[PDB]
Amino acid sequence: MTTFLIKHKASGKFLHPKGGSSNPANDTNLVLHSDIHERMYFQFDVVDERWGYIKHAASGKIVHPLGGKADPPNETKLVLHQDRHDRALFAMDFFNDNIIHKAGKYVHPKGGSTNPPNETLTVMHGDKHGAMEFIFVSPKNKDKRVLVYV
């Protein structure tokens, strides 16, 4: 029941539903944006050990690779959708600072910039570098890491 911000480590921007709606439509893209508000709070619903759903707190929709592929290819866009099923399972790796999908690819800003412009889309991608790192922080203190698994 921890509520948290998903902060892009290299830039300090955050994960947002595009347009910042408190009830985004199914398949709304997830983007990076520098602002902080209640419509970009997230929660994490643990389903199976490390695996769980990344839940948009304001709407209850969860993060999906678009099209619900179990093994999405590189550049598959990330979106919000009400559906709850095991092709939307991620782990929040707070030791290596990344978000990893069940099939092994990572959440990236599209293009992998260390300082992506606001509204950059997010995609799945297998590579690791400094610009796909994320930390999970308190909505009350964007520099304080919080535990997403409790």
Tab-separated table of N, CA and C in Angstrom:
chain	number	residue	atom	x	y	z
A	1	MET	N	0.824	-1.206	0.000
A	1	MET	CA	0.000	0.000	0.000
A	1	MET	C	0.853	1.249	0.000
A	2	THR	N	2.138	1.104	-0.317
A	2	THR	CA	2.981	2.280	-0.472
A	2	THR	C	2.597	2.997	-1.761
A	3	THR	N	2.426	4.309	-1.679
A	3	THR	CA	2.265	5.149	-2.854
A	3	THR	C	3.610	5.793	-3.144
A	4	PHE	N	3.977	5.878	-4.423
A	4	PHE	CA	5.302	6.371	-4.754
A	4	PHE	C	5.330	7.027	-6.128
A	5	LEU	N	6.412	7.781	-6.368
A	5	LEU	CA	6.736	8.347	-7.674
A	5	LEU	C	7.785	7.474	-8.355
A	6	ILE	N	7.647	7.288	-9.655
A	6	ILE	CA	8.649	6.582	-10.444
A	6	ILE	C	9.536	7.643	-11.082
A	7	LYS	N	10.724	7.833	-10.518
A	7	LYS	CA	11.636	8.893	-10.926
A	7	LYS	C	12.722	8.362	-11.858
A	8	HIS	N	12.821	8.969	-13.055
A	8	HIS	CA	13.901	8.665	-13.984
A	8	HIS	C	15.201	9.191	-13.380
A	9	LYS	N	16.147	8.287	-13.128
A	9	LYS	CA	17.285	8.628	-12.275
A	9	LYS	C	18.171	9.683	-12.930
A	10	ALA	N	18.419	9.553	-14.231
A	10	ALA	CA	19.367	10.451	-14.891
A	10	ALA	C	18.807	11.860	-15.040
A	11	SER	N	17.486	12.017	-15.103
A	11	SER	CA	16.929	13.332	-15.375
A	11	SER	C	16.110	13.925	-14.244
A	12	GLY	N	15.696	13.131	-13.258
A	12	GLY	CA	14.751	13.607	-12.273
A	12	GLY	C	13.322	13.776	-12.756
A	13	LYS	N	13.014	13.451	-14.011
A	13	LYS	CA	11.617	13.468	-14.430
A	13	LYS	C	10.921	12.203	-13.918
A	14	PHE	N	9.613	12.138	-14.119
A	14	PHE	CA	8.818	11.041	-13.580
A	14	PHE	C	7.975	10.384	-14.660
A	15	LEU	N	7.504	9.172	-14.338
A	15	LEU	CA	6.506	8.509	-15.165
A	15	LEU	C	5.125	9.097	-14.901
A	16	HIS	N	4.418	9.452	-15.982
A	16	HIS	CA	3.086	10.032	-16.066
A	16	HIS	C	2.234	9.281	-17.075
A	17	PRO	N	0.924	9.234	-16.858
A	17	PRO	CA	0.026	8.934	-17.975
A	17	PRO	C	0.007	10.160	-18.872
A	18	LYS	N	0.145	9.943	-20.182
A	18	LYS	CA	0.133	11.067	-21.113
A	18	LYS	C	-1.152	11.863	-20.934
A	19	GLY	N	-1.006	13.175	-20.784
A	19	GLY	CA	-2.139	14.013	-20.472
A	19	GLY	C	-2.496	14.100	-19.010
A	20	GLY	N	-1.934	13.249	-18.160
A	20	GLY	CA	-2.089	13.404	-16.724
A	20	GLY	C	-3.489	13.226	-16.179
A	21	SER	N	-4.302	12.386	-16.811
A	21	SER	CA	-5.686	12.211	-16.403
A	21	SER	C	-5.800	11.387	-15.123
A	22	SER	N	-6.814	11.709	-14.320
A	22	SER	CA	-7.121	10.837	-13.196
A	22	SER	C	-7.878	9.573	-13.617
A	23	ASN	N	-8.309	9.479	-14.877
A	23	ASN	CA	-8.863	8.240	-15.428
A	23	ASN	C	-8.502	8.158	-16.902
A	24	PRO	N	-7.239	7.891	-17.208
A	24	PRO	CA	-6.835	7.792	-18.611
A	24	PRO	C	-7.552	6.643	-19.307
A	25	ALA	N	-7.800	6.828	-20.596
A	25	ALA	CA	-8.429	5.779	-21.363
A	25	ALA	C	-7.472	4.608	-21.516
A	26	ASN	N	-8.047	3.429	-21.658
A	26	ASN	CA	-7.249	2.265	-21.982
A	26	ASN	C	-6.328	2.572	-23.150
A	27	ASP	N	-5.098	2.083	-23.037
A	27	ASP	CA	-4.023	2.234	-24.014
A	27	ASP	C	-3.458	3.648	-24.066
A	28	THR	N	-3.718	4.474	-23.054
A	28	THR	CA	-2.986	5.735	-22.925
A	28	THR	C	-1.491	5.465	-22.717
A	29	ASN	N	-0.636	6.144	-23.487
A	29	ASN	CA	0.806	5.951	-23.334
A	29	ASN	C	1.280	6.424	-21.964
A	30	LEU	N	2.313	5.760	-21.439
A	30	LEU	CA	3.066	6.276	-20.296
A	30	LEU	C	4.242	7.092	-20.808
A	31	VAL	N	4.408	8.303	-20.272
A	31	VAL	CA	5.458	9.202	-20.731
A	31	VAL	C	6.295	9.671	-19.550
A	32	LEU	N	7.457	10.253	-19.874
A	32	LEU	CA	8.248	10.989	-18.898
A	32	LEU	C	7.856	12.465	-18.890
A	33	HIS	N	7.724	13.019	-17.687
A	33	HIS	CA	7.336	14.410	-17.504
A	33	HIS	C	7.922	14.916	-16.194
A	34	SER	N	8.315	16.196	-16.180
A	34	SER	CA	9.042	16.733	-15.037
A	34	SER	C	8.143	17.085	-13.853
A	35	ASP	N	6.832	17.167	-14.050
A	35	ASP	CA	5.926	17.639	-13.013
A	35	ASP	C	5.584	16.539	-12.003
A	36	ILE	N	5.070	16.964	-10.846
A	36	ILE	CA	4.658	16.082	-9.756
A	36	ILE	C	3.231	16.454	-9.360
A	37	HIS	N	2.326	15.473	-9.363
A	37	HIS	CA	0.961	15.680	-8.884
A	37	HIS	C	0.348	14.315	-8.597
A	38	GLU	N	-0.881	14.313	-8.079
A	38	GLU	CA	-1.504	13.071	-7.627
A	38	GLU	C	-1.868	12.142	-8.776
A	39	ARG	N	-1.956	12.661	-9.989
A	39	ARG	CA	-2.280	11.831	-11.131
A	39	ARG	C	-1.053	11.139	-11.709
A	40	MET	N	0.119	11.302	-11.101
A	40	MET	CA	1.272	10.493	-11.478
A	40	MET	C	1.784	9.668	-10.301
A	41	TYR	N	0.996	9.538	-9.239
A	41	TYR	CA	1.336	8.599	-8.183
A	41	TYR	C	1.141	7.175	-8.678
A	42	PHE	N	1.985	6.278	-8.192
A	42	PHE	CA	1.842	4.868	-8.532
A	42	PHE	C	1.839	4.011	-7.279
A	43	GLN	N	1.303	2.807	-7.431
A	43	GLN	CA	1.356	1.777	-6.419
A	43	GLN	C	1.836	0.491	-7.077
A	44	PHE	N	2.109	-0.513	-6.255
A	44	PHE	CA	2.634	-1.773	-6.775
A	44	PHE	C	1.895	-2.918	-6.109
A	45	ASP	N	1.144	-3.668	-6.905
A	45	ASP	CA	0.322	-4.776	-6.419
A	45	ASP	C	1.155	-6.043	-6.602
A	46	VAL	N	1.719	-6.568	-5.503
A	46	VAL	CA	2.541	-7.769	-5.578
A	46	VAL	C	1.664	-8.983	-5.852
A	47	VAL	N	2.038	-9.765	-6.866
A	47	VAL	CA	1.277	-10.933	-7.287
A	47	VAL	C	2.030	-12.230	-7.015
A	48	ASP	N	3.347	-12.244	-7.237
A	48	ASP	CA	4.089	-13.501	-7.141
A	48	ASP	C	5.568	-13.182	-6.909
A	49	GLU	N	5.978	-13.182	-5.635
A	49	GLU	CA	7.355	-12.897	-5.231
A	49	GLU	C	7.760	-11.512	-5.724
A	50	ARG	N	8.681	-11.442	-6.686
A	50	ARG	CA	9.093	-10.134	-7.200
A	50	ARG	C	8.094	-9.541	-8.192
A	51	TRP	N	7.199	-10.352	-8.742
A	51	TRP	CA	6.380	-9.933	-9.866
A	51	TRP	C	5.090	-9.287	-9.382
A	52	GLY	N	4.704	-8.203	-10.044
A	52	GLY	CA	3.439	-7.590	-9.690
A	52	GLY	C	3.026	-6.586	-10.741
A	53	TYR	N	1.924	-5.898	-10.450
A	53	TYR	CA	1.320	-4.931	-11.360
A	53	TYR	C	1.742	-3.534	-10.931
A	54	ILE	N	2.162	-2.714	-11.888
A	54	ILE	CA	2.408	-1.291	-11.622
A	54	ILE	C	1.096	-0.548	-11.842
A	55	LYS	N	0.526	-0.019	-10.762
A	55	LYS	CA	-0.844	0.479	-10.748
A	55	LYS	C	-0.869	1.999	-10.685
A	56	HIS	N	-1.587	2.612	-11.623
A	56	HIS	CA	-1.793	4.059	-11.583
A	56	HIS	C	-2.750	4.356	-10.441
A	57	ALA	N	-2.273	5.083	-9.423
A	57	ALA	CA	-3.032	5.177	-8.177
A	57	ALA	C	-4.375	5.871	-8.384
A	58	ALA	N	-4.412	6.917	-9.216
A	58	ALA	CA	-5.638	7.697	-9.353
A	58	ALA	C	-6.725	6.910	-10.071
A	59	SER	N	-6.347	5.998	-10.972
A	59	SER	CA	-7.325	5.304	-11.788
A	59	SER	C	-7.414	3.807	-11.543
A	60	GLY	N	-6.414	3.189	-10.914
A	60	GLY	CA	-6.409	1.739	-10.816
A	60	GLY	C	-6.022	1.000	-12.081
A	61	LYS	N	-5.831	1.688	-13.208
A	61	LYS	CA	-5.306	0.994	-14.377
A	61	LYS	C	-3.832	0.637	-14.156
A	62	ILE	N	-3.347	-0.376	-14.888
A	62	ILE	CA	-1.988	-0.856	-14.667
A	62	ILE	C	-1.181	-0.749	-15.955
A	63	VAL	N	0.145	-0.782	-15.788
A	63	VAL	CA	1.076	-0.635	-16.901
A	63	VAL	C	1.097	-1.905	-17.733
A	64	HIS	N	0.941	-1.759	-19.053
A	64	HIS	CA	0.980	-2.877	-19.988
A	64	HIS	C	1.942	-2.563	-21.123
A	65	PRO	N	2.681	-3.540	-21.623
A	65	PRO	CA	3.195	-3.387	-22.985
A	65	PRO	C	2.019	-3.445	-23.947
A	66	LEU	N	1.988	-2.498	-24.886
A	66	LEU	CA	0.861	-2.363	-25.803
A	66	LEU	C	0.616	-3.658	-26.561
A	67	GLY	N	-0.660	-4.020	-26.700
A	67	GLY	CA	-0.994	-5.263	-27.360
A	67	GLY	C	-0.901	-6.483	-26.478
A	68	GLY	N	-0.449	-6.324	-25.235
A	68	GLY	CA	-0.427	-7.432	-24.296
A	68	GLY	C	0.415	-8.610	-24.725
A	69	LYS	N	1.510	-8.371	-25.450
A	69	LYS	CA	2.447	-9.441	-25.771
A	69	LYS	C	3.131	-9.962	-24.513
A	70	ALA	N	3.255	-11.290	-24.414
A	70	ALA	CA	3.992	-11.887	-23.302
A	70	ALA	C	5.488	-11.630	-23.408
A	71	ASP	N	6.016	-11.579	-24.623
A	71	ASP	CA	7.447	-11.398	-24.851
A	71	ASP	C	7.598	-10.240	-25.818
A	72	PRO	N	7.276	-9.028	-25.376
A	72	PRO	CA	7.231	-7.904	-26.300
A	72	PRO	C	8.604	-7.631	-26.882
A	73	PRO	N	8.674	-7.323	-28.176
A	73	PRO	CA	9.963	-6.974	-28.793
A	73	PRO	C	10.451	-5.608	-28.328
A	74	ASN	N	11.744	-5.339	-28.573
A	74	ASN	CA	12.280	-3.999	-28.318
A	74	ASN	C	11.412	-2.960	-29.010
A	75	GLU	N	11.264	-1.806	-28.357
A	75	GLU	CA	10.488	-0.611	-28.718
A	75	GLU	C	8.984	-0.776	-28.524
A	76	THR	N	8.508	-1.891	-27.980
A	76	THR	CA	7.087	-1.994	-27.655
A	76	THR	C	6.693	-0.886	-26.681
A	77	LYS	N	5.719	-0.059	-27.073
A	77	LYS	CA	5.281	1.051	-26.224
A	77	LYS	C	4.592	0.571	-24.946
A	78	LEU	N	4.816	1.312	-23.849
A	78	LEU	CA	4.142	1.072	-22.572
A	78	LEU	C	2.892	1.938	-22.433
A	79	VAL	N	1.794	1.331	-21.958
A	79	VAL	CA	0.515	2.035	-21.820
A	79	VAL	C	-0.186	1.636	-20.525
A	80	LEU	N	-1.264	2.357	-20.211
A	80	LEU	CA	-2.147	1.973	-19.113
A	80	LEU	C	-3.369	1.260	-19.670
A	81	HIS	N	-3.866	0.285	-18.907
A	81	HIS	CA	-5.040	-0.483	-19.300
A	81	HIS	C	-5.682	-1.091	-18.045
A	82	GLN	N	-7.012	-1.203	-18.054
A	82	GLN	CA	-7.676	-1.764	-16.881
A	82	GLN	C	-7.408	-3.256	-16.701
A	83	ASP	N	-7.042	-3.970	-17.756
A	83	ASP	CA	-6.919	-5.424	-17.673
A	83	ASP	C	-5.875	-5.843	-16.646
A	84	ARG	N	-6.179	-6.896	-15.885
A	84	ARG	CA	-5.199	-7.426	-14.939
A	84	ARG	C	-4.907	-8.855	-15.367
A	85	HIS	N	-3.690	-9.096	-15.854
A	85	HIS	CA	-3.292	-10.440	-16.264
A	85	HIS	C	-1.770	-10.496	-16.289
A	86	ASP	N	-1.232	-11.713	-16.413
A	86	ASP	CA	0.171	-11.977	-16.133
A	86	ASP	C	1.111	-11.497	-17.240
A	87	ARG	N	0.601	-10.956	-18.352
A	87	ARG	CA	1.484	-10.302	-19.309
A	87	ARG	C	1.779	-8.857	-18.911
A	88	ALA	N	1.176	-8.388	-17.816
A	88	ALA	CA	1.484	-7.083	-17.247
A	88	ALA	C	2.325	-7.177	-15.978
A	89	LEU	N	3.069	-8.273	-15.782
A	89	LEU	CA	3.892	-8.419	-14.586
A	89	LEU	C	5.276	-7.797	-14.776
A	90	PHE	N	5.664	-6.955	-13.810
A	90	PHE	CA	6.985	-6.354	-13.722
A	90	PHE	C	7.562	-6.612	-12.341
A	91	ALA	N	8.875	-6.401	-12.208
A	91	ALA	CA	9.535	-6.319	-10.912
A	91	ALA	C	10.192	-4.948	-10.782
A	92	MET	N	10.169	-4.408	-9.575
A	92	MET	CA	10.752	-3.098	-9.282
A	92	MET	C	12.112	-3.345	-8.644
A	93	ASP	N	13.161	-3.292	-9.457
A	93	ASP	CA	14.496	-3.644	-8.985
A	93	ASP	C	15.072	-2.393	-8.350
A	94	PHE	N	14.939	-2.299	-7.027
A	94	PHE	CA	15.453	-1.140	-6.316
A	94	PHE	C	16.906	-1.315	-5.884
A	95	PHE	N	17.569	-2.399	-6.301
A	95	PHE	CA	19.002	-2.542	-6.069
A	95	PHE	C	19.827	-2.145	-7.280
A	96	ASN	N	19.422	-2.564	-8.478
A	96	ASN	CA	20.039	-2.091	-9.711
A	96	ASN	C	19.349	-0.858	-10.286
A	97	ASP	N	18.223	-0.448	-9.710
A	97	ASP	CA	17.480	0.759	-10.091
A	97	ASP	C	16.885	0.647	-11.492
A	98	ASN	N	16.062	-0.381	-11.718
A	98	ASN	CA	15.363	-0.436	-12.984
A	98	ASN	C	14.020	-1.130	-12.812
A	99	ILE	N	13.238	-1.111	-13.886
A	99	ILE	CA	11.943	-1.774	-13.912
A	99	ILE	C	12.023	-2.813	-15.011
A	100	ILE	N	11.793	-4.078	-14.657
A	100	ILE	CA	12.001	-5.189	-15.580
A	100	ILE	C	10.691	-5.948	-15.754
A	101	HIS	N	10.380	-6.273	-17.013
A	101	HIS	CA	9.179	-7.012	-17.370
A	101	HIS	C	9.444	-8.502	-17.187
A	102	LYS	N	8.359	-9.269	-17.095
A	102	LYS	CA	8.477	-10.695	-16.816
A	102	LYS	C	9.372	-11.382	-17.842
A	103	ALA	N	9.303	-10.949	-19.099
A	103	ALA	CA	10.093	-11.538	-20.173
A	103	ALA	C	11.514	-11.000	-20.248
A	104	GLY	N	11.916	-10.087	-19.371
A	104	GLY	CA	13.326	-9.787	-19.198
A	104	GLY	C	13.772	-8.448	-19.743
A	105	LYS	N	12.911	-7.724	-20.459
A	105	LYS	CA	13.256	-6.406	-20.971
A	105	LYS	C	12.893	-5.328	-19.940
A	106	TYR	N	13.406	-4.114	-20.154
A	106	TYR	CA	13.361	-3.028	-19.180
A	106	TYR	C	12.509	-1.862	-19.673
A	107	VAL	N	11.996	-1.085	-18.718
A	107	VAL	CA	11.331	0.169	-19.047
A	107	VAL	C	12.392	1.194	-19.422
A	108	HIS	N	12.242	1.789	-20.600
A	108	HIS	CA	13.100	2.828	-21.147
A	108	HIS	C	12.291	4.070	-21.500
A	109	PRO	N	12.883	5.252	-21.370
A	109	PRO	CA	12.438	6.361	-22.211
A	109	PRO	C	12.797	6.044	-23.653
A	110	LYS	N	11.858	6.286	-24.559
A	110	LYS	CA	12.159	6.023	-25.955
A	110	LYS	C	13.317	6.908	-26.393
A	111	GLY	N	14.337	6.274	-26.996
A	111	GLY	CA	15.566	6.935	-27.379
A	111	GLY	C	16.653	6.907	-26.327
A	112	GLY	N	16.297	6.688	-25.062
A	112	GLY	CA	17.293	6.518	-24.016
A	112	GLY	C	18.101	7.743	-23.674
A	113	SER	N	17.502	8.936	-23.746
A	113	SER	CA	18.222	10.160	-23.430
A	113	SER	C	18.417	10.277	-21.924
A	114	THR	N	19.569	10.807	-21.504
A	114	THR	CA	19.763	11.052	-20.079
A	114	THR	C	18.913	12.205	-19.592
A	115	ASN	N	18.354	12.994	-20.495
A	115	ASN	CA	17.469	14.093	-20.118
A	115	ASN	C	16.357	14.219	-21.154
A	116	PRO	N	15.424	13.263	-21.184
A	116	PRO	CA	14.421	13.242	-22.256
A	116	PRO	C	13.484	14.427	-22.134
A	117	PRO	N	13.050	14.989	-23.267
A	117	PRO	CA	12.025	16.027	-23.217
A	117	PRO	C	10.749	15.462	-22.625
A	118	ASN	N	10.024	16.332	-21.919
A	118	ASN	CA	8.667	16.016	-21.482
A	118	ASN	C	7.857	15.433	-22.628
A	119	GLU	N	7.032	14.432	-22.297
A	119	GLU	CA	6.157	13.671	-23.197
A	119	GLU	C	6.913	12.622	-23.988
A	120	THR	N	8.202	12.407	-23.738
A	120	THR	CA	8.841	11.262	-24.363
A	120	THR	C	8.048	10.024	-23.970
A	121	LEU	N	7.778	9.167	-24.947
A	121	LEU	CA	7.095	7.912	-24.655
A	121	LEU	C	8.045	6.948	-23.959
A	122	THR	N	7.479	5.924	-23.322
A	122	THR	CA	8.290	4.860	-22.753
A	122	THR	C	8.064	3.570	-23.527
A	123	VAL	N	9.111	2.766	-23.608
A	123	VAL	CA	9.078	1.526	-24.376
A	123	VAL	C	9.793	0.435	-23.603
A	124	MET	N	9.568	-0.795	-24.037
A	124	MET	CA	10.351	-1.927	-23.578
A	124	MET	C	11.645	-2.026	-24.387
A	125	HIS	N	12.739	-2.365	-23.710
A	125	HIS	CA	14.001	-2.509	-24.425
A	125	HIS	C	14.964	-3.325	-23.585
A	126	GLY	N	15.708	-4.211	-24.246
A	126	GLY	CA	16.518	-5.177	-23.523
A	126	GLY	C	17.802	-4.627	-22.945
A	127	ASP	N	18.257	-3.474	-23.415
A	127	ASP	CA	19.570	-2.988	-23.020
A	127	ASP	C	19.535	-2.333	-21.650
A	128	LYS	N	20.716	-2.254	-21.031
A	128	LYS	CA	20.934	-1.501	-19.804
A	128	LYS	C	21.945	-0.394	-20.049
A	129	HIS	N	21.645	0.784	-19.538
A	129	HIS	CA	22.588	1.887	-19.498
A	129	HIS	C	22.066	2.863	-18.456
A	130	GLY	N	22.797	3.959	-18.263
A	130	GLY	CA	22.442	4.896	-17.213
A	130	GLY	C	21.073	5.509	-17.394
A	131	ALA	N	20.598	5.601	-18.631
A	131	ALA	CA	19.395	6.374	-18.898
A	131	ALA	C	18.115	5.545	-18.854
A	132	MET	N	18.184	4.252	-18.518
A	132	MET	CA	16.974	3.491	-18.232
A	132	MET	C	16.837	3.178	-16.734
A	133	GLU	N	17.605	3.859	-15.889
A	133	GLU	CA	17.498	3.631	-14.454
A	133	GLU	C	16.370	4.451	-13.823
A	134	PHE	N	15.716	3.852	-12.821
A	134	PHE	CA	14.607	4.461	-12.109
A	134	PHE	C	14.757	4.185	-10.619
A	135	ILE	N	14.320	5.146	-9.813
A	135	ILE	CA	14.211	4.991	-8.370
A	135	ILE	C	12.790	5.376	-7.968
A	136	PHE	N	12.373	4.879	-6.805
A	136	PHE	CA	10.987	4.930	-6.363
A	136	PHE	C	10.964	5.727	-5.078
A	137	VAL	N	10.287	6.879	-5.107
A	137	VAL	CA	10.468	7.869	-4.058
A	137	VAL	C	9.127	8.317	-3.493
A	138	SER	N	9.214	8.925	-2.310
A	138	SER	CA	8.030	9.347	-1.590
A	138	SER	C	7.372	10.514	-2.310
A	139	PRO	N	6.043	10.512	-2.439
A	139	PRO	CA	5.361	11.703	-2.981
A	139	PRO	C	5.582	12.940	-2.133
A	140	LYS	N	5.846	12.756	-0.845
A	140	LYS	CA	6.146	13.847	0.071
A	140	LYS	C	7.622	14.249	0.094
A	141	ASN	N	8.501	13.526	-0.594
A	141	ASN	CA	9.921	13.853	-0.603
A	141	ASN	C	10.563	13.118	-1.761
A	142	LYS	N	10.695	13.802	-2.901
A	142	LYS	CA	11.118	13.186	-4.149
A	142	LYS	C	12.570	12.757	-4.131
A	143	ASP	N	13.299	13.012	-3.048
A	143	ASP	CA	14.655	12.502	-2.913
A	143	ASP	C	14.762	11.322	-1.946
A	144	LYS	N	13.653	10.884	-1.353
A	144	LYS	CA	13.648	9.822	-0.342
A	144	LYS	C	13.102	8.532	-0.955
A	145	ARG	N	13.948	7.524	-1.094
A	145	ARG	CA	13.469	6.247	-1.613
A	145	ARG	C	12.517	5.609	-0.611
A	146	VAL	N	11.467	4.971	-1.133
A	146	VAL	CA	10.504	4.206	-0.356
A	146	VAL	C	10.426	2.774	-0.893
A	147	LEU	N	10.013	1.867	-0.008
A	147	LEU	CA	9.900	0.438	-0.319
A	147	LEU	C	8.579	0.177	-1.031
A	148	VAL	N	8.635	-0.270	-2.292
A	148	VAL	CA	7.402	-0.463	-3.052
A	148	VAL	C	6.769	-1.826	-2.811
A	149	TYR	N	7.471	-2.748	-2.155
A	149	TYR	CA	6.922	-4.086	-2.041
A	149	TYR	C	5.969	-4.236	-0.866
A	150	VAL	N	6.100	-3.419	0.162
A	150	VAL	CA	5.095	-3.386	1.231
A	150	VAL	C	4.002	-2.375	0.955
